Amino acid sequence: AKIVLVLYDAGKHAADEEKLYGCTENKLGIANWLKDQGHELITTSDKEGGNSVLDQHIPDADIIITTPFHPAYITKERIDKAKKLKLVVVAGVGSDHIDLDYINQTGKKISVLEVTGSNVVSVAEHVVMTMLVLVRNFVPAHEQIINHDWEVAAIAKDAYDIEGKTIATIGAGRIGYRVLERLVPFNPKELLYYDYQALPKDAEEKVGARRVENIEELVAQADIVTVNAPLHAGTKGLINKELLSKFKKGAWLVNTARGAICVAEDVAAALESGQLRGYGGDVWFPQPAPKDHPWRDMRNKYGAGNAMTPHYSGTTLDAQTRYAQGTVNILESFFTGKFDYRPQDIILLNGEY
Amino acid sequence: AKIVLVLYDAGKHAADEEKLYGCTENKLGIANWLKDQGHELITTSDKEGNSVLDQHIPDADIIITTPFHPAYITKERIDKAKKLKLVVVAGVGSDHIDLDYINQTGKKISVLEVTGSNVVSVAEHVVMTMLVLVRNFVPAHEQIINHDWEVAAIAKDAYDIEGKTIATIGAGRIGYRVLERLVPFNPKELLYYDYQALPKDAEEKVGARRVENIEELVAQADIVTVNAPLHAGTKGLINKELLSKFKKGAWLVNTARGAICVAEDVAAALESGQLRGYGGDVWFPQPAPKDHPWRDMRNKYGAGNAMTPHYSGTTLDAQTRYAQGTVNILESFFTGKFDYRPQDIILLNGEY
C-alpha cells in the first residue's frame, strides 16, 4: 500500500529531539514498521501548488496521513484525483482540512479517522496556564527579569489571583470540561458554561458548573472567558466589537479553539482600550499568523496582557506520542482488514457518518 | 497611638491602581480608618541610613512592615523603640524582624502577621510556573512578539504536566495548596518530603505519598517545588551535590526563599541540562543584582527560565487580604481585647 504522510519539516529540531514524532524527519516513528510490512511511505511537507509532492502521489495513494499542525487540504479536487484513496488519517484531532462533506454527499468509499481524545489534556492545560499567566501578569514580570530590571509595583498593579474569579467557558465539550475540572481546586467564585446542549447534571455538579442560556449573559458576569468550541456558523466571528462591549470591563480572554471565532482587530482594539485586561491562546486566523498579524504586537495600556503563542498547545511531546501510537493503531486496523477502529476515532467509515 | 507604617514608593503605579495598598502613596488603605479612630499615622519608605523611620521609632506604639520592602526591626531599633507594643507584618514573612532579640529583652512586644493571606497567591504562582516551564511557554511567546513562527522549535521541549511525577519539599500551607491544585492535572504521582506527616485524610485528599528523605524524593521527580521555610536544614539545600541526584531534565520551582538554593549551582544545572527548567520569584540576594546569574541562565535551547521578581504574594487580591488582616490585628490591639487569630501570632508580648 502507498501511504502519503504530510507533516512539517522540523529541520535541526528533529535532530535535537527523537520524540518529536510529528515532522517529516521522524515520520511519526512509523517508517520502519511500514517498510517491514511492505508498504511504501512518501513523507513530505510539500503540500501546496499543483506541482507539489502531495499532488504527485495523490493519484495512487491508498492512505493519506495529515496533521492539523501542517494540514494537507484534502479538497474535492484532490479527492477526485485520488483514485485509490481508501483512508485519510489525522495524526491528531481536527479535520477541517478534509472535505468530509464532499466524501459523505457523494458516497465515496473513503474512511476518515482521527486520534480522538489525544489532544484534549494538552489544550486544557494550555488554557489553564494561559489564564494563570494573564491573570497573574506573568509576562511583563518575566520580561523585567531578563531585561535586568526590578520594579515590583509595575507588575503588582495588574496582578490578581485566579481564586475568587468568575470563569466562563464557551463550549463544554471534551476540552472545555477538562479545563473546568482543572479549575476546581483553584477556588473560583463560580464556574460557568454556555453550550448548545447541557452538560449532564452529574457532570455540572462534579465541577460546580452553572449553565448560562446565552453568550451575552455568560460573558457579562465573567472575570475570565475561555473559548472551547468548534468553528461553525454559531461561532464564526463570535468574539466581535459588539459582544466584547458586553464583557466585564478588564476581563481576560483565552482562545485555544479556533482563530476565526474571534474578529482579530476587534480583540486588539478591546485589549488596547481596557475592555480586555488580557488576551492569550495559541490559535490564529490566518494560521500560520503572518508577521503583521495584530495579535502579535497588541498590548494593554501597561504594555502587557498578551499571552499569545504559535499554534502548538496540542503538539507537546506527550501529545505527539499519543498521535503516533493512535496512527499506528488506526493503520493496523486497516492493514489487517479487521477495521476494528476505536468507535470515537471514526469520522467517516467508507463515506458514512 | 502612634503607628509607623513602612512600605515603599510605588511612584506613578500607585496612582494607576487604587487596590495597590502596600505602598506609601496608598498607606494600606487604612489612613482614614486610623484618623477616624484618633490615631497618628506616619508613613515612610525611608528606612535606611537619621532616617524617617528612625526619627519616629523612639515613640512609636506600633510599627507596620511589609515583607516585600522590609524595614529591618533590628536589635538597635528595638532598644530605641521605647513605647513599642506591637509590630505587624502586612503580609507573611518575618525575616526582617529580630524576634529572637525581642524575646530575649523580656519586652512586652507582640509581633503578628496575616497568616494564610499569601498562601493561595504563592500556590497559584507555583502551579503556573510549573505549567509555563513544562509546556515551554516562555520561548513560545517570545517567538510571537519577535514576529516569528517555528512550532518545532517550541514543541521539541514542550510536555504536558499530566503523567509527570511531582514532588514538594515542604507540605505546609503553600506546599499543600500546590498539591491540591495539581490533583486534577492527572500527575503520575504527587510526592512530598516534610518534617511531619500530612494528617492522614489530607494526605489522601491529594493522593500524596510521603518520601522519607530529600535525595530519594528528587531522584524520582520530574518536577520539584520548594515550599519550605528557610532554616539550618534548608539553607543551601539545593546545591550541586543534591542537583546531581535530580532526574536528568527535571523542572525546579522555588517561591520559598532564594537562599534555599545555591545560585550558581542552579544556573550550572540548567546550562548543563541537569535541569530542563527553573522558575520562581525568590532570589538571594533580594532584590536581585542586575547580573544575578538567574536572570540570564538558560537551558541549551535558550529557554527553561521562568523567573519573575518577588511578587507572587503581591497580587491585588493578596494585598486586600493584607490590608483587611492588618485592620483586624490593629483593632484587636486597640480595643485591648487582644483577640488575635491564634495563627497570626508570632510573639504575644515577647513570648513565642
mmCIF file of C-alpha atoms in Angstrom, chain B:
data_model
loop_
_atom_site.group_PDB
_atom_site.id
_atom_site.type_symbol
_atom_site.label_atom_id
_atom_site.label_comp_id
_atom_site.label_asym_id
_atom_site.label_seq_id
_atom_site.Cartn_x
_atom_site.Cartn_y
_atom_site.Cartn_z
ATOM 1 C CA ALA B 1 -1.485 55.776 69.490
ATOM 2 C CA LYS B 2 1.373 56.417 67.102
ATOM 3 C CA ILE B 3 1.656 53.935 64.242
ATOM 4 C CA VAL B 4 4.662 53.919 61.915
ATOM 5 C CA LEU B 5 3.970 52.306 58.574
ATOM 6 C CA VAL B 6 6.949 51.380 56.407
ATOM 7 C CA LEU B 7 6.344 50.479 52.821
ATOM 8 C CA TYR B 8 7.840 51.574 49.510
ATOM 9 C CA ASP B 9 7.210 54.286 46.925
ATOM 10 C CA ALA B 10 5.218 52.788 44.039
ATOM 11 C CA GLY B 11 5.511 56.139 42.234
ATOM 12 C CA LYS B 12 3.164 56.559 39.275
ATOM 13 C CA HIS B 13 1.880 52.955 39.701
ATOM 14 C CA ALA B 14 0.127 53.892 42.959
ATOM 15 C CA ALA B 15 -1.994 56.446 41.054
ATOM 16 C CA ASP B 16 -2.680 53.843 38.323
ATOM 17 C CA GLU B 17 -4.077 51.298 40.775
ATOM 18 C CA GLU B 18 -6.195 52.062 43.864
ATOM 19 C CA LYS B 19 -6.006 48.456 45.102
ATOM 20 C CA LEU B 20 -2.209 48.724 45.248
ATOM 21 C CA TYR B 21 -2.385 49.143 49.018
ATOM 22 C CA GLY B 22 1.118 48.047 50.022
ATOM 23 C CA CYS B 23 2.828 51.295 49.046
ATOM 24 C CA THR B 24 3.405 54.560 50.921
ATOM 25 C CA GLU B 25 1.277 56.512 48.448
ATOM 26 C CA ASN B 26 -1.788 54.362 49.304
ATOM 27 C CA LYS B 27 -0.991 53.672 53.007
ATOM 28 C CA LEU B 28 -2.580 50.158 53.169
ATOM 29 C CA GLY B 29 -5.950 51.878 52.677
ATOM 30 C CA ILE B 30 -6.004 52.442 56.465
ATOM 31 C CA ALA B 31 -5.068 56.137 56.719
ATOM 32 C CA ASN B 32 -8.653 57.345 57.160
ATOM 33 C CA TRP B 33 -9.665 54.349 59.265
ATOM 34 C CA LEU B 34 -6.769 55.277 61.582
ATOM 35 C CA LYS B 35 -7.503 59.036 61.679
ATOM 36 C CA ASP B 36 -11.205 58.388 62.423
ATOM 37 C CA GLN B 37 -10.088 56.445 65.483
ATOM 38 C CA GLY B 38 -7.897 59.280 66.751
ATOM 39 C CA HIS B 39 -4.531 57.675 65.934
ATOM 40 C CA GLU B 40 -1.437 59.255 64.358
ATOM 41 C CA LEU B 41 -0.065 57.511 61.250
ATOM 42 C CA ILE B 42 3.472 58.071 59.990
ATOM 43 C CA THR B 43 4.086 56.597 56.539
ATOM 44 C CA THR B 44 7.596 56.370 55.057
ATOM 45 C CA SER B 45 9.814 54.451 52.617
ATOM 46 C CA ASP B 46 12.909 55.916 54.251
ATOM 47 C CA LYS B 47 14.220 53.029 56.359
ATOM 48 C CA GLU B 48 17.960 53.191 55.688
ATOM 49 C CA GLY B 49 20.755 55.456 56.871
ATOM 50 C CA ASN B 50 18.522 59.759 60.879
ATOM 51 C CA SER B 51 16.098 58.046 58.510
ATOM 52 C CA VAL B 52 12.427 58.943 58.918
ATOM 53 C CA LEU B 53 11.627 55.522 60.386
ATOM 54 C CA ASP B 54 14.398 56.093 62.947
ATOM 55 C CA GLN B 55 13.098 59.583 63.798
ATOM 56 C CA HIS B 56 9.743 58.084 64.833
ATOM 57 C CA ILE B 57 10.929 54.812 66.392
ATOM 58 C CA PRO B 58 11.514 56.240 69.930
ATOM 59 C CA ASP B 59 7.783 56.936 70.441
ATOM 60 C CA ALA B 60 6.003 54.543 68.036
ATOM 61 C CA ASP B 61 3.435 52.351 69.766
ATOM 62 C CA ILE B 62 3.079 50.301 66.591
ATOM 63 C CA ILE B 63 5.237 49.612 63.570
ATOM 64 C CA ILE B 64 3.733 48.061 60.437
ATOM 65 C CA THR B 65 6.087 46.475 57.906
ATOM 66 C CA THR B 66 5.830 44.651 54.585
ATOM 67 C CA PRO B 67 7.923 41.616 53.690
ATOM 68 C CA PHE B 68 8.163 42.959 50.125
ATOM 69 C CA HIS B 69 10.022 46.074 51.272
ATOM 70 C CA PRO B 70 11.173 45.020 54.706
ATOM 71 C CA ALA B 71 12.062 47.582 57.338
ATOM 72 C CA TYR B 72 14.557 45.689 59.485
ATOM 73 C CA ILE B 73 13.382 45.740 63.054
ATOM 74 C CA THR B 74 16.911 45.443 64.336
ATOM 75 C CA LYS B 75 18.410 44.944 67.780
ATOM 76 C CA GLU B 76 19.297 48.685 67.935
ATOM 77 C CA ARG B 77 15.873 49.738 66.740
ATOM 78 C CA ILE B 78 14.263 47.523 69.389
ATOM 79 C CA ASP B 79 16.460 49.238 72.001
ATOM 80 C CA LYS B 80 15.461 52.711 70.791
ATOM 81 C CA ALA B 81 11.741 51.915 70.493
ATOM 82 C CA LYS B 82 10.722 52.971 73.986
ATOM 83 C CA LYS B 83 6.954 52.737 73.509
ATOM 84 C CA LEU B 84 6.873 49.773 71.112
ATOM 85 C CA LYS B 85 3.964 47.409 71.893
ATOM 86 C CA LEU B 86 3.128 45.821 68.557
ATOM 87 C CA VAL B 87 4.892 45.043 65.309
ATOM 88 C CA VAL B 88 2.761 43.974 62.356
ATOM 89 C CA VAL B 89 3.677 42.376 59.066
ATOM 90 C CA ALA B 90 1.105 43.453 56.478
ATOM 91 C CA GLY B 91 1.606 40.107 54.832
ATOM 92 C CA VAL B 92 3.503 36.987 55.768
ATOM 93 C CA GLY B 93 7.200 36.671 56.437
ATOM 94 C CA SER B 94 9.031 37.984 59.463
ATOM 95 C CA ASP B 95 12.740 37.507 58.474
ATOM 96 C CA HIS B 96 13.386 41.203 58.829
ATOM 97 C CA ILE B 97 12.285 41.290 62.490
ATOM 98 C CA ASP B 98 14.747 40.259 65.206
ATOM 99 C CA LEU B 99 12.191 38.077 67.046
ATOM 100 C CA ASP B 100 14.911 36.326 68.983
ATOM 101 C CA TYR B 101 16.073 39.676 70.324
ATOM 102 C CA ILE B 102 12.561 40.893 71.199
ATOM 103 C CA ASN B 103 12.025 37.631 73.049
ATOM 104 C CA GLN B 104 15.349 37.964 74.828
ATOM 105 C CA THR B 105 14.673 41.510 76.097
ATOM 106 C CA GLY B 106 11.590 40.496 78.037
ATOM 107 C CA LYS B 107 9.793 43.497 76.495
ATOM 108 C CA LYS B 108 6.057 43.058 76.051
ATOM 109 C CA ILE B 109 6.019 43.416 72.273
ATOM 110 C CA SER B 110 3.593 41.417 70.213
ATOM 111 C CA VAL B 111 4.540 40.542 66.653
ATOM 112 C CA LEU B 112 1.799 39.479 64.257
ATOM 113 C CA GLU B 113 1.437 38.658 60.587
ATOM 114 C CA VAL B 114 -1.595 37.923 58.446
ATOM 115 C CA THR B 115 -1.109 34.151 58.350
ATOM 116 C CA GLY B 116 -2.725 32.354 55.409
ATOM 117 C CA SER B 117 -3.173 35.525 53.315
ATOM 118 C CA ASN B 118 -0.302 34.873 50.863
ATOM 119 C CA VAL B 119 -0.794 31.117 50.522
ATOM 120 C CA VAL B 120 -3.183 30.832 47.589
ATOM 121 C CA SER B 121 -1.297 33.570 45.650
ATOM 122 C CA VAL B 122 2.011 31.718 46.012
ATOM 123 C CA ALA B 123 0.444 28.305 45.353
ATOM 124 C CA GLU B 124 -1.054 29.620 42.104
ATOM 125 C CA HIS B 125 2.337 31.063 41.153
ATOM 126 C CA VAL B 126 3.974 27.668 41.659
ATOM 127 C CA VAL B 127 1.474 25.763 39.524
ATOM 128 C CA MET B 128 1.601 28.499 36.889
ATOM 129 C CA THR B 129 5.402 28.331 36.817
ATOM 130 C CA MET B 130 5.318 24.554 36.527
ATOM 131 C CA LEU B 131 2.947 24.762 33.555
ATOM 132 C CA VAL B 132 4.953 27.600 31.977
ATOM 133 C CA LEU B 133 8.200 25.597 32.188
ATOM 134 C CA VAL B 134 6.796 22.148 31.350
ATOM 135 C CA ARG B 135 4.784 23.445 28.371
ATOM 136 C CA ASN B 136 7.680 25.642 27.206
ATOM 137 C CA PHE B 137 5.613 28.827 27.218
ATOM 138 C CA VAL B 138 8.342 31.420 27.512
ATOM 139 C CA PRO B 139 10.157 30.805 24.163
ATOM 140 C CA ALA B 140 6.727 30.306 22.539
ATOM 141 C CA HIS B 141 5.532 33.763 23.471
ATOM 142 C CA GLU B 142 8.952 35.224 22.562
ATOM 143 C CA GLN B 143 8.559 33.871 19.019
ATOM 144 C CA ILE B 144 5.205 35.607 18.573
ATOM 145 C CA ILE B 145 6.334 39.047 19.729
ATOM 146 C CA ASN B 146 9.558 38.628 17.680
ATOM 147 C CA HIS B 147 7.312 38.173 14.640
ATOM 148 C CA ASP B 148 8.477 34.582 14.163
ATOM 149 C CA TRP B 149 6.676 31.268 13.860
ATOM 150 C CA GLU B 150 8.518 27.957 14.199
ATOM 151 C CA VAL B 151 6.390 25.363 16.047
ATOM 152 C CA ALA B 152 9.063 22.633 16.061
ATOM 153 C CA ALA B 153 11.443 24.956 17.974
ATOM 154 C CA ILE B 154 8.882 25.090 20.806
ATOM 155 C CA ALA B 155 7.383 21.616 20.568
ATOM 156 C CA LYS B 156 10.791 19.907 20.824
ATOM 157 C CA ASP B 157 10.890 20.783 24.554
ATOM 158 C CA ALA B 158 7.202 21.038 25.429
ATOM 159 C CA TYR B 159 5.427 18.453 27.559
ATOM 160 C CA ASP B 160 2.095 18.089 29.382
ATOM 161 C CA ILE B 161 2.129 18.226 33.153
ATOM 162 C CA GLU B 162 -0.148 15.149 33.022
ATOM 163 C CA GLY B 163 1.760 11.907 33.767
ATOM 164 C CA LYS B 164 4.658 13.691 35.498
ATOM 165 C CA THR B 165 5.847 12.783 38.996
ATOM 166 C CA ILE B 166 5.741 15.963 41.029
ATOM 167 C CA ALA B 167 7.418 16.444 44.400
ATOM 168 C CA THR B 168 7.173 19.179 47.022
ATOM 169 C CA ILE B 169 9.893 19.889 49.563
ATOM 170 C CA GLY B 170 7.611 21.016 52.365
ATOM 171 C CA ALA B 171 3.904 20.401 52.549
ATOM 172 C CA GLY B 172 2.859 23.334 54.735
ATOM 173 C CA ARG B 173 0.188 25.835 53.719
ATOM 174 C CA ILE B 174 1.645 26.678 50.296
ATOM 175 C CA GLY B 175 3.004 23.187 49.521
ATOM 176 C CA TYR B 176 -0.316 21.545 50.305
ATOM 177 C CA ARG B 177 -2.350 24.065 48.237
ATOM 178 C CA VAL B 178 0.031 23.428 45.308
ATOM 179 C CA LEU B 179 -0.699 19.728 45.657
ATOM 180 C CA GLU B 180 -4.445 20.400 45.792
ATOM 181 C CA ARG B 181 -4.256 22.416 42.558
ATOM 182 C CA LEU B 182 -2.243 19.674 40.854
ATOM 183 C CA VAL B 183 -4.703 16.796 41.539
ATOM 184 C CA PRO B 184 -7.000 17.367 38.503
ATOM 185 C CA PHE B 185 -3.969 17.627 36.151
ATOM 186 C CA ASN B 186 -3.566 13.849 36.481
ATOM 187 C CA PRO B 187 0.106 13.741 37.580
ATOM 188 C CA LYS B 188 1.644 10.251 37.630
ATOM 189 C CA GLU B 189 2.116 10.857 41.346
ATOM 190 C CA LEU B 190 2.292 13.659 43.892
ATOM 191 C CA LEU B 191 5.080 13.275 46.471
ATOM 192 C CA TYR B 192 6.217 15.235 49.488
ATOM 193 C CA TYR B 193 9.090 15.495 51.898
ATOM 194 C CA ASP B 194 8.484 17.200 55.255
ATOM 195 C CA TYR B 195 9.464 17.066 58.945
ATOM 196 C CA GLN B 196 5.970 15.967 59.838
ATOM 197 C CA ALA B 197 3.314 13.934 58.075
ATOM 198 C CA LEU B 198 0.227 15.342 56.482
ATOM 199 C CA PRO B 199 -2.800 14.432 58.571
ATOM 200 C CA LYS B 200 -3.968 11.140 57.092
ATOM 201 C CA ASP B 201 -7.139 12.443 55.463
ATOM 202 C CA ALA B 202 -5.365 15.453 53.977
ATOM 203 C CA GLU B 203 -2.708 13.127 52.574
ATOM 204 C CA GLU B 204 -5.429 11.025 50.959
ATOM 205 C CA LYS B 205 -7.301 14.023 49.557
ATOM 206 C CA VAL B 206 -4.437 14.858 47.182
ATOM 207 C CA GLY B 207 -3.230 11.259 46.738
ATOM 208 C CA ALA B 208 0.177 12.219 48.063
ATOM 209 C CA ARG B 209 2.921 9.820 49.066
ATOM 210 C CA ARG B 210 5.458 10.821 51.706
ATOM 211 C CA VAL B 211 9.089 10.242 50.807
ATOM 212 C CA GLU B 212 11.394 9.823 53.814
ATOM 213 C CA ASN B 213 14.470 11.787 52.632
ATOM 214 C CA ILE B 214 15.193 14.587 50.160
ATOM 215 C CA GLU B 215 17.629 12.668 47.915
ATOM 216 C CA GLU B 216 15.092 9.874 47.318
ATOM 217 C CA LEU B 217 12.394 12.485 46.715
ATOM 218 C CA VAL B 218 14.230 14.401 43.999
ATOM 219 C CA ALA B 219 15.662 11.280 42.300
ATOM 220 C CA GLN B 220 12.197 10.123 41.122
ATOM 221 C CA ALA B 221 10.641 13.552 40.476
ATOM 222 C CA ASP B 222 10.050 15.093 37.058
ATOM 223 C CA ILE B 223 9.093 18.361 38.753
ATOM 224 C CA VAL B 224 10.282 19.510 42.179
ATOM 225 C CA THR B 225 8.878 22.508 44.039
ATOM 226 C CA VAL B 226 10.339 24.124 47.145
ATOM 227 C CA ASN B 227 7.748 25.159 49.769
ATOM 228 C CA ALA B 228 9.753 25.012 52.998
ATOM 229 C CA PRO B 229 10.884 27.700 55.430
ATOM 230 C CA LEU B 230 14.469 28.860 55.423
ATOM 231 C CA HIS B 231 16.394 27.425 58.371
ATOM 232 C CA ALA B 232 19.502 25.314 59.117
ATOM 233 C CA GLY B 233 18.095 22.294 57.287
ATOM 234 C CA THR B 234 17.231 24.216 54.123
ATOM 235 C CA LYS B 235 19.865 26.929 53.683
ATOM 236 C CA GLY B 236 21.852 25.987 50.569
ATOM 237 C CA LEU B 237 19.825 22.773 50.322
ATOM 238 C CA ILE B 238 19.635 22.923 46.546
ATOM 239 C CA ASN B 239 23.349 22.748 45.803
ATOM 240 C CA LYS B 240 25.392 20.998 43.081
ATOM 241 C CA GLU B 241 25.538 17.730 45.033
ATOM 242 C CA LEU B 242 21.773 17.467 45.549
ATOM 243 C CA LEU B 243 21.116 18.698 41.994
ATOM 244 C CA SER B 244 23.261 15.865 40.647
ATOM 245 C CA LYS B 245 20.669 13.495 42.185
ATOM 246 C CA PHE B 246 17.767 15.162 40.368
ATOM 247 C CA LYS B 247 16.290 13.281 37.480
ATOM 248 C CA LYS B 248 18.105 14.493 34.367
ATOM 249 C CA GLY B 249 15.978 17.193 32.728
ATOM 250 C CA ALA B 250 13.839 17.914 35.792
ATOM 251 C CA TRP B 251 11.948 21.164 36.254
ATOM 252 C CA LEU B 252 12.551 23.037 39.509
ATOM 253 C CA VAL B 253 10.374 25.723 41.049
ATOM 254 C CA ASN B 254 11.208 27.820 44.068
ATOM 255 C CA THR B 255 8.972 30.503 45.530
ATOM 256 C CA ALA B 256 10.051 29.899 49.125
ATOM 257 C CA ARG B 257 13.401 31.556 49.793
ATOM 258 C CA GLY B 258 16.234 32.283 47.365
ATOM 259 C CA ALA B 259 18.831 31.203 49.911
ATOM 260 C CA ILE B 260 17.477 27.577 49.926
ATOM 261 C CA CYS B 261 19.341 27.299 46.580
ATOM 262 C CA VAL B 262 22.990 27.927 45.820
ATOM 263 C CA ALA B 263 22.537 30.361 42.930
ATOM 264 C CA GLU B 264 25.480 29.374 40.726
ATOM 265 C CA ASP B 265 24.766 25.681 41.281
ATOM 266 C CA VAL B 266 21.196 26.040 39.942
ATOM 267 C CA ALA B 267 22.418 28.044 36.922
ATOM 268 C CA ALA B 268 25.090 25.404 36.228
ATOM 269 C CA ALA B 269 22.470 22.640 36.379
ATOM 270 C CA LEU B 270 20.200 24.470 33.915
ATOM 271 C CA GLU B 271 23.017 25.140 31.430
ATOM 272 C CA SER B 272 24.213 21.507 31.609
ATOM 273 C CA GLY B 273 20.734 20.002 31.210
ATOM 274 C CA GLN B 274 20.625 18.537 34.726
ATOM 275 C CA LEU B 275 17.590 20.817 34.904
ATOM 276 C CA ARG B 276 15.345 21.426 31.908
ATOM 277 C CA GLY B 277 13.846 24.470 33.571
ATOM 278 C CA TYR B 278 13.943 26.655 36.671
ATOM 279 C CA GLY B 279 11.413 29.190 37.883
ATOM 280 C CA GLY B 280 10.008 31.055 40.823
ATOM 281 C CA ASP B 281 10.043 34.554 42.209
ATOM 282 C CA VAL B 282 12.569 34.375 45.079
ATOM 283 C CA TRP B 283 16.199 35.478 44.898
ATOM 284 C CA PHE B 284 19.296 35.704 47.060
ATOM 285 C CA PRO B 285 20.362 38.454 47.359
ATOM 286 C CA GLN B 286 16.938 40.145 47.006
ATOM 287 C CA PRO B 287 16.265 42.409 45.141
ATOM 288 C CA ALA B 288 18.363 40.567 42.576
ATOM 289 C CA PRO B 289 21.519 42.340 41.375
ATOM 290 C CA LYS B 290 21.490 43.149 37.648
ATOM 291 C CA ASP B 291 23.993 40.384 36.900
ATOM 292 C CA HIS B 292 22.396 37.805 39.210
ATOM 293 C CA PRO B 293 23.033 34.505 37.312
ATOM 294 C CA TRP B 294 19.350 33.525 37.409
ATOM 295 C CA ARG B 295 18.493 36.449 35.117
ATOM 296 C CA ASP B 296 20.450 35.214 32.093
ATOM 297 C CA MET B 297 20.674 31.465 32.716
ATOM 298 C CA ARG B 298 19.061 29.279 30.048
ATOM 299 C CA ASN B 299 18.920 25.653 29.084
ATOM 300 C CA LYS B 300 20.712 24.598 25.884
ATOM 301 C CA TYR B 301 17.657 25.693 23.861
ATOM 302 C CA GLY B 302 17.725 29.265 25.167
ATOM 303 C CA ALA B 303 14.723 28.625 27.416
ATOM 304 C CA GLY B 304 13.969 26.877 30.755
ATOM 305 C CA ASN B 305 13.828 30.186 32.651
ATOM 306 C CA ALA B 306 10.560 31.313 34.213
ATOM 307 C CA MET B 307 11.964 33.713 36.809
ATOM 308 C CA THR B 308 9.971 36.733 37.974
ATOM 309 C CA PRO B 309 10.726 39.425 40.537
ATOM 310 C CA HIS B 310 9.461 38.701 44.042
ATOM 311 C CA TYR B 311 5.776 39.483 43.500
ATOM 312 C CA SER B 312 3.683 36.281 43.750
ATOM 313 C CA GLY B 313 2.396 37.388 47.177
ATOM 314 C CA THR B 314 1.865 40.987 45.952
ATOM 315 C CA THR B 315 -1.211 40.400 43.773
ATOM 316 C CA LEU B 316 -4.071 42.854 44.358
ATOM 317 C CA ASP B 317 -6.126 40.046 45.874
ATOM 318 C CA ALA B 318 -3.396 39.260 48.455
ATOM 319 C CA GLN B 319 -2.947 42.986 49.166
ATOM 320 C CA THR B 320 -6.666 43.309 50.030
ATOM 321 C CA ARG B 321 -6.249 40.391 52.455
ATOM 322 C CA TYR B 322 -3.125 42.060 53.922
ATOM 323 C CA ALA B 323 -4.927 45.384 54.446
ATOM 324 C CA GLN B 324 -8.005 43.758 55.983
ATOM 325 C CA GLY B 325 -5.872 41.455 58.188
ATOM 326 C CA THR B 326 -3.819 44.447 59.327
ATOM 327 C CA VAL B 327 -7.061 46.188 60.324
ATOM 328 C CA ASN B 328 -8.109 43.036 62.233
ATOM 329 C CA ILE B 329 -4.826 42.818 64.139
ATOM 330 C CA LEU B 330 -4.781 46.548 64.923
ATOM 331 C CA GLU B 331 -8.352 46.567 66.230
ATOM 332 C CA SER B 332 -7.648 43.564 68.447
ATOM 333 C CA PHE B 333 -4.784 45.613 69.869
ATOM 334 C CA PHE B 334 -6.586 48.998 70.066
ATOM 335 C CA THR B 335 -9.651 47.624 71.869
ATOM 336 C CA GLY B 336 -7.364 45.966 74.410
ATOM 337 C CA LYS B 337 -9.166 42.677 73.746
ATOM 338 C CA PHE B 338 -6.068 41.147 72.066
ATOM 339 C CA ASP B 339 -8.463 38.669 70.467
ATOM 340 C CA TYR B 340 -5.877 37.880 67.786
ATOM 341 C CA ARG B 341 -6.374 34.973 65.365
ATOM 342 C CA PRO B 342 -4.178 32.326 67.007
ATOM 343 C CA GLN B 343 -2.423 31.651 63.689
ATOM 344 C CA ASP B 344 -1.457 35.339 63.317
ATOM 345 C CA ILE B 345 0.635 35.374 66.465
ATOM 346 C CA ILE B 346 4.394 35.236 66.115
ATOM 347 C CA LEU B 347 5.108 36.677 69.571
ATOM 348 C CA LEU B 348 2.497 37.538 72.134
ATOM 349 C CA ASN B 349 4.026 40.091 74.456
ATOM 350 C CA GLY B 350 7.511 38.831 73.647
ATOM 351 C CA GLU B 351 6.675 35.109 74.016
ATOM 352 C CA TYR B 352 6.698 32.658 71.057
#
